[PDB]
Design a protein around this ligand. Sequence first.
Ligand SMILES: Nc1ncnc2c1ncn2[C@@H]1O[C@H](COP(=O)(O)OP(=O)(O)OP(=O)(O)O)[C@@H](O)[C@H]1O
Ligand SMILES: Nc1ncnc2c1ncn2[C@@H]1O[C@H](COP(=O)(O)OP(=O)(O)OP(=O)(O)O)[C@@H](O)[C@H]1O
Ligand SMILES: Nc1ncnc2c1ncn2[C@@H]1O[C@H](COP(=O)(O)OP(=O)(O)OP(=O)(O)O)[C@@H](O)[C@H]1O
Ligand SMILES: [K+]
Ligand SMILES: [K+]
Ligand SMILES: [K+]
Ligand SMILES: [Mg+2]
Ligand SMILES: [Mg+2]
Ligand SMILES: [Mg+2]
Lengths: 527, 527, 527
Amino acid sequence: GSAKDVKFGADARALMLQGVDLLADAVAVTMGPKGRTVIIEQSWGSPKVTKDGVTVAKSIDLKDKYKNIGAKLVQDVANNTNEEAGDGTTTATVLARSIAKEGFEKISKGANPVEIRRGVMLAVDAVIAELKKQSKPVTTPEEIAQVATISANGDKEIGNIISDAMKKVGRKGVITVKDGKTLNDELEIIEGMKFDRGYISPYFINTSKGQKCEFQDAYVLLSEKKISSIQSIVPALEIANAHRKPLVIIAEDVDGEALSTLVLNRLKVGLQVVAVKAPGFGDNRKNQLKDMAIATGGAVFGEEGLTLNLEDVQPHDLGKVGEVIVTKDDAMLLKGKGDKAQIEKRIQEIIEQLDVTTSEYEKEKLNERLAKLSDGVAVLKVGGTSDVEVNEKKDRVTDALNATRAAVEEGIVLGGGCALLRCIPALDSLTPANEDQKIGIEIIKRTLKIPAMTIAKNAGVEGSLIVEKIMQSSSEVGYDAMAGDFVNMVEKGIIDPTKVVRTALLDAAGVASLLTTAEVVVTEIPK
Amino acid sequence: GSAKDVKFGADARALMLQGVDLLADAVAVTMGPKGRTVIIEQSWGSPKVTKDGVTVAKSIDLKDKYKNIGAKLVQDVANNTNEEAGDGTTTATVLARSIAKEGFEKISKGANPVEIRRGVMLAVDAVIAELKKQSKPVTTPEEIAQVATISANGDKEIGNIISDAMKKVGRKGVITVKDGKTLNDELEIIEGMKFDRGYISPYFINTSKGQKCEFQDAYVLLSEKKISSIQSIVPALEIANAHRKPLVIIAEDVDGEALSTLVLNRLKVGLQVVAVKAPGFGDNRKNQLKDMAIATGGAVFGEEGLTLNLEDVQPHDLGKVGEVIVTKDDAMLLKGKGDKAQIEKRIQEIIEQLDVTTSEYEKEKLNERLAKLSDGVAVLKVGGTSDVEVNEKKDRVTDALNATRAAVEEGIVLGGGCALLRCIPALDSLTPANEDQKIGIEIIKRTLKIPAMTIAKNAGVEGSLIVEKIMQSSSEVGYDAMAGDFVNMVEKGIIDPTKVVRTALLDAAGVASLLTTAEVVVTEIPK
Amino acid sequence: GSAKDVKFGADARALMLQGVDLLADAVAVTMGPKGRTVIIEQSWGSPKVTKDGVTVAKSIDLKDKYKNIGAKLVQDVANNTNEEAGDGTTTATVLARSIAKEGFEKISKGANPVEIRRGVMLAVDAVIAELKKQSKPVTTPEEIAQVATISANGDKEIGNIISDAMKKVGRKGVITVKDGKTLNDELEIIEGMKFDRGYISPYFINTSKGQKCEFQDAYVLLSEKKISSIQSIVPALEIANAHRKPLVIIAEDVDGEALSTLVLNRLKVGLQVVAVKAPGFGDNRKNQLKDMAIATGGAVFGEEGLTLNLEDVQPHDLGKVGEVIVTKDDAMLLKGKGDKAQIEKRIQEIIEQLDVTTSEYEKEKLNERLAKLSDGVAVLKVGGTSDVEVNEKKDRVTDALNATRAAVEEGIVLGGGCALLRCIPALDSLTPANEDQKIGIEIIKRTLKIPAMTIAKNAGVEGSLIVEKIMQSSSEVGYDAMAGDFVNMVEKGIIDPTKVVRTALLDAAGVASLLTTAEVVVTEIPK
Ligand SMILES: Nc1ncnc2c1ncn2[C@@H]1O[C@H](COP(=O)(O)OP(=O)(O)OP(=O)(O)O)[C@@H](O)[C@H]1O
Ligand SMILES: Nc1ncnc2c1ncn2[C@@H]1O[C@H](COP(=O)(O)OP(=O)(O)OP(=O)(O)O)[C@@H](O)[C@H]1O
Ligand SMILES: Nc1ncnc2c1ncn2[C@@H]1O[C@H](COP(=O)(O)OP(=O)(O)OP(=O)(O)O)[C@@H](O)[C@H]1O
Ligand SMILES: [K+]
Ligand SMILES: [K+]
Ligand SMILES: [K+]
Ligand SMILES: [Mg+2]
Ligand SMILES: [Mg+2]
Ligand SMILES: [Mg+2]
């Protein structure tokens, strides 16, 4: 019901292209090894410094609504590329700008933009098939380090630390990025099963050097419900005392008279016992507790289904660990004596649960449980002098992790925009159905040179001459923009994930070729 | 009580025509195989790209009140056409603009616009009778595919997938359109009694590959009330254990001690049983429960009318399926061993309930129940790279589905505006009662050329020459605007459903001929 | 989603440099022995006068958002330097301005600012290594007084009183700064164990001169719970009456009939007894109570773990102190007769607790507990005529305290900016990898002269000539800006903590070299 302004044809298209051009010009300064950064004002505190294309894209909104429509569409391109691949958003932005500009130039009275878009999509499918033919699987960890180094803007230490993390926890393992309080990056490998619950009582500390409770060859008692009575905790303590063996109690909570019994027995006679709360806040807590039961060889007590009571506990119902460390904030179990076949069955059960989940949040929980049961987790702490530097480097570390995961999944192609450059002869062999599809194919053919030209332009050289000399070169030769030299790209480690390149192309082409079909733009009157 | 501005005669009509012309100019660029799109700004996020005439119409409101009145009236035209036919809104908009313009041109001192409107309505009735004589019923699925292809802007794959859906679930079957997460469209056919209710507890899973419960030749237990007590669930379990057959329990809820009994018997001894919540909220729950009871050959328990109790259950009161799948979110029953004649009696019951409903929401529920009982449901998932592309393609898929349903209902005529073009000699044989009705008949006669003119104009050719060459040709020959050729329209598949054509004409003519009777316009003073 | 302004290249960098220059110009007037003050308007009351660089930095926010971004970044530099070192914020601000200006001058088409930043960081690491080789540990308290005198802007009395405080309570002891109600500074040394809890009732006062309760060779009763009953309090009173010794009751609260028993026995027969509330709110109360029990040789009663009851108290369960003084607001225990080995064990327990905590709030609590158990606490009261003078002098006292702690931790270097001046030949021996890193090394090489030039400029002489004559001088000779002479800096006491110098350089360099990588600045449109 709001009053609207309606614009027609070339004027509306030119305003939308002005918005697209402003956003893409801001994004394009960040591309490549000699890309620069963008400072974004934040309303609350310090400004944000970033080389990340989607971050620059999402921060730009325009007062002019016709320009803002084009800005929102290229924002959609960058956001879709980021959600699908986690990298290549700057490439997607410059490809989308190129497709939008070439499509806007080709609209005449006799032109049919919908069939032009059909030609664009056919050419993009041909290029993606050529990219999949060009791709090679990742076999060596040196390739992993090269991919992570390229995606972290040439930082060899980030590539090395990501390669080390994937050596330790697996190429499909769990690696997380968090703030580091030091100046340098540090990799922490957490093995076994560590969770974020400390000791319930500080009296359980027996190693006063680190203010922690340490046992070797300890029994494990696992309860799905709270332990608060004398009769629910005394027989397990009798088993632990008669076997002369430490006991770790992990339950929902230990409180009331049971806690007083535990503290009294530890303080007076010196009974080796520690009580830890269970991790999780729902069915994840039950799943992790059953994972602990399988890994240690114990049984869950007070469960809803089997209904096993803590009054009648046998020595075979308790798990066995070789080492347990309980601090104020966390506890960790080492060398659980559970059956290996049962641990493998639980691992394949977690895998098959992962195959049927699409919530994108329970998948993280299942991957964490699988990592705790199988290989552990890696934590990358990013160093830096200040928070702005830490966030800027964290963006590149996240980009390198996403690119390395994508390269593990789908292989690698040539870096530096050369993979798209080598797909041009695949477009040269196509036969268009009509003139509009020929126009769309030629639009994509012109667009395929854009990433290499942008990388060369940010390096201070003439992009067109560089691109033509790459095209006259052999298929293994591209341009090192950092060195200013024409090199073997695979030998120098300038490589890109195939998934990132094809995602950027597809996400750019769909939105931009839809945008070039427009004849009328409707916007609200600014109030 | 607010202050008003009052305008008289030609100035008021010219302002109203300016509003009509603005909205119709924005709508008319989208018409036909070489129509273009309209981008509409959305306040909350990304803009909308559409070829849909009613969507463009509803987005445009004008600041000038007199222009906004004409815009509102043509919005009413497009909305009524969309609600009645689901297609043809652009044709209705351009026909309404033509009628409004030619009626405003013909108003003089001696003219009687009410009698002109009478002549318009008489001419429209004559054209609609000629359209019904021109119509031909749809006999082959190739015609179904051609109709869906034309209505999806020439997309042959949308036409093929709609034709496949109508082959599998019937031409009157239930077909729904929803988002797809892939690049391409998929047709999913859901057979049997499938409802969005999973298992109650995860201990019922016996097929760990997909995390699902799987039985074959299973008893089915249906309860209209909750099952919370031991004695309401034990005898059915005794029947299932004595016959050594699996049991599926469908009820409002299975909780408390009965759920504990089910989990205990599944875990300890291995009793094959699963419990699923009932679908529906209200009388729909008991209606689908009775549907499942008839389809499986069981009896609903705990009902208000017959009052069958769960403590006295016989083996013949339980349904018999040959197959059941229970997953986290859904449950589906296959090969229910119900009495067939009872199933057709329930089907005709649902049919006669459909004949006496007009709520437009319970009719959907009855159609879903009939599809579950008889032929299943089809789901079209629309692929795309981004949400704006998905919505744009979904608009055309919905248009093609509505047009195909209308073509199954009332037959097909020649497409490309030729069906209205061949109705001109029906107006040439009319005898008006007076001069005003002659004026109205001539208004409709001029308006009948407008859709073909607009289609040819959007293709970049002179529309009047195209229309005159069509009129000087034999009745089967029309203009292929996509190919730029004069072709046999039935042979080339350029066909339109008769319902859409007559709905667009009637909806345009009524509102526009009412608008052309106006002499005085009263608007509020803008604050 | 708000509208944004986007600026490119040299114009954006010039506006950001204007903001950086304004904030740094306001900060730089305060630098050195002839620095001047900045008056900051406060909204609620009297204005604030300060020589402190971070205080000046935080007060300045600019209306122009491009200038405000540079202002926020140098604010980050000053704040990070203040949080890490507590001193040297003006030096960090002028270093950051120098690095930002030199980096902005060096940006051209062929330059790579990220590699320039790499060269900057490598040069800064080389300078920090040279600084650590130049450092000398603090051995004499005369050096402590010299450090505190330099950091208090030449105030020898502040240096002397800080040196006296560190002589009394230790160089790692607890020293706090607060307001003084007199014209002059006073150092108060609080020995033993004093806490902010007075008498419960005023009837316990036996020394009427100061309205205080005084005992010598008194029993101590420590209770973790409230004492409100006759049976809880009478047996301890019988022990105290039979031994004819005074009793001090430290509990959570003493109320009800136990309190009336205490008052009645004090007033009628003259039983020597006093009751004092326990200090602390939480686990700190229990930890402090156990600290008093260990230091006095008593036992805590009414505890959660050991559960010692007050109805059965032996004479050995009571602490012994040679002196107790209970006033209206505080009570102190002196010459506690606890076992020295257990006090040492509790001290190492507190130390190992300090090693594993990073909360920055209860670390102060642990330091206070260690000071109470070991060496006492020092209170510096800052004298002054008015609150603005008191705050201005307190800023310098806090600066001198932080600088002295830093000098105890990491040693000292030459003051007057000469430590960075003598690190230039370490940069002259570096070999850059390329031209951009050479540019960064040269940026740091120019920046290393900035603090000495700023100190000389605030003293009214030409800074470049002074710096040239310092560099032509032998390594122990610098410029006494206060005396206007070239002197041996170590023997004149013009020395700086190494930690402060390296923290200022690193915190300036990281943020400013990140800032000089920017090409695009995005700000919101001002409303
Ligand atoms: N030394 C180099 N020589 C040539 N090309 C290089 C070099 N290093 C990296 N590149 C190329 O630069 C591109 C990566 O640039 P950048 O990371 O800035 O953009 P992006 O991946 O498109 O976006 P974003 O990382 O912001 O999401 C890749 O095509 C990569 O191959
Ligand atoms: N190849 C073709 N040649 C000629 N006419 C064609 C061709 N393809 C489709 N048409 C005609 O185009 C018209 C459909 O155009 P369009 O779908 O844009 O408008 P609409 O049905 O009036 O409105 P809407 O779909 O927006 O509700 C029909 O009259 C159809 O016969
Ligand atoms: N008499 C002196 N001659 C030369 N330099 C001196 C003299 N006294 C102090 N300085 C130098 O002055 C500097 C301290 O100046 P100032 O305290 O104003 O700034 P800051 O320590 O950088 O910052 P802030 O105290 O505001 O956090 C040190 O480098 C110190 O060596
Ligand atoms: K980038
Ligand atoms: K249309
Ligand atoms: K200062
Ligand atoms: Mg990248
Ligand atoms: Mg249509
Ligand atoms: Mg200072």
